[PDB]
Symmetry: C2
């Protein structure tokens, strides 16, 4: 079950994407962090459905 | 600068929200993880602008 999760996270690059989203949040300091995160992933959702 | 980031992350509950998003991803195993994350934060963006 844990190994399952580990593999899924690895497969979809979740660790790096979340890492990067946190770095951009702290760097930019959004007035609207939730909007920022939504838009961050929305651009990735776009490639996913491409 | 690091303390700055630490405080911002703490202020906006970023650690717990990302933690929870990862737990739901591994639990549900989305065919579309990026869509999942976009929608996850979109619901939070909604409360943010409320």
């Amino acid at each position: 079950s844990l190994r399952e999760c580990e593999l899924y996270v690895q497969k979809h690059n979740i660790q790096a994407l979340l890492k990067d989203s946190i770095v951009q949040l702290c760097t930019a300091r959004p007035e609207r962090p939730m909007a920022f995160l939504r838009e961050y992933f929305e651009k990735l959702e776009k490639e996913e459905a491409k």
